[PDB]
């Protein structure tokens, strides 16, 4: 995965292939091993979900969290689409209804 | 001849000396105008044209999203913040989610989470308004010139003699138009686009190369994103949350989704709606009537000075009969005498030779000077049995014809139709301006309402006995001292005198 | 139907002679209904002289 | 993960640790490699979610599916609870209201 | 002495020879019964006891789930099936979901998905019904035996002489009870639990070791899982979907969740509800009145044959005054003469020595033979100023007392209270059976309604003048020929003669 | 109040003499209201002989 | 961080840099390792938040506490302001309204 | 000349022998006072001055906090305590928070937590009261001395001859003032600051170098910290919790926050409020009228003894006309004759030479002895056409003038204005003390109310015919025995006799 | 307007002669309205002697 810093904050460009594996990079504090448990991760495409995932102490189990590193809080970003067809999942099935007349 | 095969056909006859005459045109019918010395005209309204329509609002059924971002803060930190919040193209929602040691911070309290994403309208539909000054009507005018009556000239490319047919565009800017029919002459038309379908509660909806008409109170009720009424490449949308669905909640993020194509919902909702057609940016409407006033001053005949036909006349087929009791006759002429008047008579017996009916087409004539030519005419046979005779000498041909019904029945039907027409012509019927046209107006409408029965009832149109009957009725009404018996009798007498003074 | 239209057209062709015959037959009945029958008789025999 | 067969159907007892990894077992047809992408998987406890996940052709990529094997359709089962405290998540927040009187 | 400190206190006096007497007991008041030769009794109703209540319905506020399973079939396969559908302990729901190549099968259409899971009720609340045969009332009976009047004996362990107090359990099975007061004698009681609080529109709700009463027209309206009362280890439930919230169907599964504890919702809904208490399986209600009839045949006095007290009487404190104008006197006796009768008189002046009032406690006596003993008595002083004298000889003590109000006012208030009481005693007041008790019944109730005023009005209870007044009134009413003046006068005369024949 | 209860109790103690005095004073008035005043006079002077 | 004692109570002057790290000092009982998990900690400035954080047994996990030492209860204090501009956050957004007239 | 360009201008004329005269001054108008032998004066009220205003209350819109501290105790420990609670500058709040083993102590219950912090007011606004003894009015007095009338002297620095203009400060301490006009003489003024704008329900609000006026019932309704006016460096505040927001609930602490600047809220709330101006600590109000009484005893003319002008008079421009029908004439004099009286007459024709109108400026004179000097005068021309003639001999100049309206209209308008003025002068109009001034008072006000019409109506002010008319009217009213005809006639006669006795 | 003000000013200048003329013309009419017309005639001819 690509690791960059824009304005004193770390961005991790993770593609589809790196799904469910940890990665180690370097920060101003030192080495950082960060695990990624992204479930809705997709291929690379303009639709990009980005969310900060926070640092925590190893003496706690993750709860309702799919990203965690231990140097600081790290911002993760990844595309969300299907078979690189430039199309989102859009499976909402709301089926909004309109008045007849 | 454009008015032959029409279900909703009327008959309008004006005064002999009366140049002006008013008519009403329906979008699904036709009007036939006849006179004593003027050729028969046929008016029809083809399409209502709407152009240069302004745009009021556009909705977006199918949309896309991209660049979803979220930010979460747990208690004792305040509300979450994101730089994309200040941007008009990014929509976000706030919420409160439960946090704990498993999410990063210790204090157990609900935190503030915000989530926004871009909004791009991939497909949209539009709504336009219709103003009275934008409407433009199209009326075709045909002339009964004993044309062949063949339906081979559908479009306006050719096979349309410019002296036999014409098109007129009535606009709200200039309602006065001057029509040139070539050798026949020129007429004047003043049409007032009033009492039509209301266009203050209708919106013209364009969607997926299709078009509909909707109600204004319903157009604003629709629940979809909408913009302000201006032309901009990218406009500040409003109420876009209705197309972006957010999940329940999550301790660290929120994944939004976009709805699918809402084309099916709109197609289902517009099932009981009216439809139309469009070309480029113009729209076509098939509903709406019109009121017009025609001035026939320079209109004359074409073959009034021609001679008689000394050739051979023959029937081309069995004469047909229309729904309005009118008979079309298709003749074939042999010989080379040039344009000559067609001698045709309608009587009760072959030896009588007395005109018993009238002709819908005035001055039937042959158009070309060819050896074997063809022509057509339209007449109205009298109720009962009759004989149509064509030609003179020992070569004249005869044909039997029959027509059911009763003269009183047709008279009453025509009187009721004329009364309905005069009731439709509520405004712009009379003139209260300069004096001298008020008596003309009352005479004109009493004629247009009672002449159909006057011609059918009072004998053989001798024009001499009817005057004596009117005089004796006036005298009988005069020598009467009782009330309510002299006024009505004198009025009826004057009415009959005037109706006999006009053309029969 | 078959004969009413014929006599109606005949009356409308020459109404003067028809009215003369009607006013002649009106004064040749002993009762009102008898006068009505006599004038309808003239109305019916009007088309065919024979 | 444990692999058993009760009545000519294969059950895969997968615990929390084996989350996001594939597993190979044996069937009457031969070897079967089956991948598991369970996102709401929990620890071992009586609350057990079980659902059949179907066989599919290799060319067609999975879509909105978190379990797939290629010998036959395989029934997966796994617990769903928090920190082995014998307690379900029960995070519905319906807050049903009753009439006053 | 249990009836002294009660706000709602009545006074019932029966005929001298009349053994039976009817009374009404309220759950917040007391009744004092006195006679000429019988000792004063005090009846009170403590608690309404409900036991052996049947169960009607049980609800489950907090529940758990386990073993969630689902099965989905896409088109051209039919309805989904699961083996756990036939089991009553597993609840499932059906639905239709869109399918495609991404979900496993080829055809592009929507399928049928079903999802069920077990249901186990961890905590529940219960609803019971209340039948008239289950109710049991408790009435305490006290006897004015010149007791010390100390409130040190609250429970029923000791310090309660069995000849001075008693408890009675009135049940719907046997309404006839025989009460033994030891040396005083025995009485009979027949109580009819009627005209109480309606128990046909009330349900007894038990929840979390707490109890309430609810309406039947709301208990069935609650939207929660329920099951009737059937003795079993595993019960079948109905309408449990209201506690299990199903997540929106996924591509091929459905994850159900269970709601949390609904205790807060029930506590909020039951805010405006009535509460009660319970012991074991029995419940206690503090609302409901009772009607009773007492037979006093074998009841006698205890110290009628005793001698007088030749010792020293002294006041222990200033005599108090209650809300009903009654005076309690607490005496201390010095000397050793054994149980002796207490000589006490009430007069208007120290030299008059004439009994002007009555005593609420009959035959005041000392209970022990100790040197320095104590006792208490309760009397009713006459309106105005009065002197209470205790003892004889040169050692008798005197005390002044004053009481406001008017005799006519008290008489009218007591008459109105007796009229209200007789109106409450609608049924079971008279007997229409064998003859001979009808006159007894009319005399008994006219006495119970008018004796309070008869004693207060007609002079000093000479028993000789009143008979003469009645005789003269009967004579005056007899020698009168006018209507509506002899019947009423004779009736009033007979009423006065009968009221004088009874005890005054 | 202070005197009404006393005279009321006195009347209720010996009603015979009170009724005798009342019927004596009843027949010593010229008008009905005068008789009422005379008997209320006797009612008031009844407690204290003096 | 600075550790002082004024009147038999320990004050820990912690600046912004020491945020999220433990510190060991000495007390009359012995060495004390105390952890600080202050999230809203700021720079040094007159606006100073001060709160006692209590001693607890190591066999229990913290429930709602961001400061914990094991010798005694220790009073922590730290500034709360932005970028050392001598200005508090004052982000209340109450927007109190007054009557017109 | 300060009263020329004023929209609201009045005219007051007193009795010939009447020294005292009452007037009313409005803050937006002017008053002109004229007499027979006294020079015309012009009074105006410039500004209301408020000084030495006391302070009532001060609010604090923007505040800061510092040194936030908290203390928590869990159950079985009692209430929390902090040393800063007893200090008035520290505000704390108490609460109950859930505790457990995670918070330090064992027992599972909720505890008591207290949290306080300092309070320092960085910015504040103040409220002052206004007392009648603090107000001070300023009135400018001008004298028509045939001044040049140039508006080049706006301020009070120079170009103001001290004998032609003056300023007077009317205070509530000493309402009696003596004005010295130099050579003209001295006058006395007694002004009563009554019936002005109420200052018992108004507060003077100072905020951010701006000032407003507010209602007392609204000033106390505001929900903000406040403190009364006490000279000190540190003030005690009340109800400061309205500016400090505490968080929900935390087990070990509570973080308070302070609100931002509330200047916008106050500016929005004070939208519909009145404004004013201030200099240093004094305030200026532009609303409020005044009543005054002038004593003109030592006031005389300046050029009464001068001679006539034997030079050349010329117009400097076309004479202007004001809204009150008054004509200003600007003359230029050539020659060196010293101060001389200006011979000017107003007539109807050049040969008539009869005074038909009056002069607003008495004794027009030239001020300097220069060769070519200038002067100005103000006159009132008669209704209709008139001729103004200036000078004598063969060098006198004439000018035409016209004025619309009617004499009766102006008379009625002046009568209504005088009636309104006398109605405004409710109190302090008459004197009920020593006798001899009551008739003077009734004559004075009947003159001030009717002289404007008396001068306009009763002929040419001959002073001889009017007396005869009054005498004959008195005689006609005397010889009349009927009621309601002699009293009114005698009253009108006496009124006319008195109005003719006064100055015309 | 143009003439009313002139005659009004004339009346107000010398009211004695005007009242004399008015009282002279008042007694030279046969009816009340005729007297009113005669005095308004004098009122109108008053400004210009001619
Ligand atoms: C993060 O945790 C990993 C776990 O092995 C460790 O190797 C690494 O040094 C840590 N990073 C730090 C402490 O900065
Ligand atoms: C399932 O797919 C894997 C992919 O490598 C393959 O090794 C295995 O043989 C397949 N099993 C079958 C086709 O039964
Ligand atoms: C606090 O706990 C640590 C744990 O390593 C220990 O080393 C230290 O001595 C303790 N402090 C005391 C008991 O004062």
Residue numbers in the entry:
A (entry chain B), D (entry chain H), G (entry chain E): 1 to 101
B (entry chain A), E (entry chain G), H (entry chain D): 1 to 504
C (entry chain C), F (entry chain I), I (entry chain F): 120 to 169
Task: Give verbatim lines from the article.
The surface of mature, infectious flaviviruses is composed of an icosahedral shell of 90 flat-lying envelope (E) protein dimers, the main target of humoral immunity. In contrast to their mature counterparts, immature virions possess 60 protruding spike-like trimers of precursor membrane (prM)-E complexes (prM3E3).
To better grasp maturation, we carry out cryo-EM reconstructions of immature Spondweni virus (SPOV), a human flavivirus of the same serogroup as ZIKV. Our samples contained a mixture of mature and immature particles (black and white arrows, respectively). The map shows the overall architecture of the spike-like trimers and extended areas of exposed membrane around the threefold and fivefold vertices. At 7.8 Å resolution, the interpretability of a map is limited. We propose that translations of glycoproteins in the immature-mature transition make use of the available space in the membrane at the five- and threefold vertices to reposition the proteins. Indeed, such translational fluctuations may explain the difficulties in achieving high resolutions in cryo-EM of immature flaviviruses.
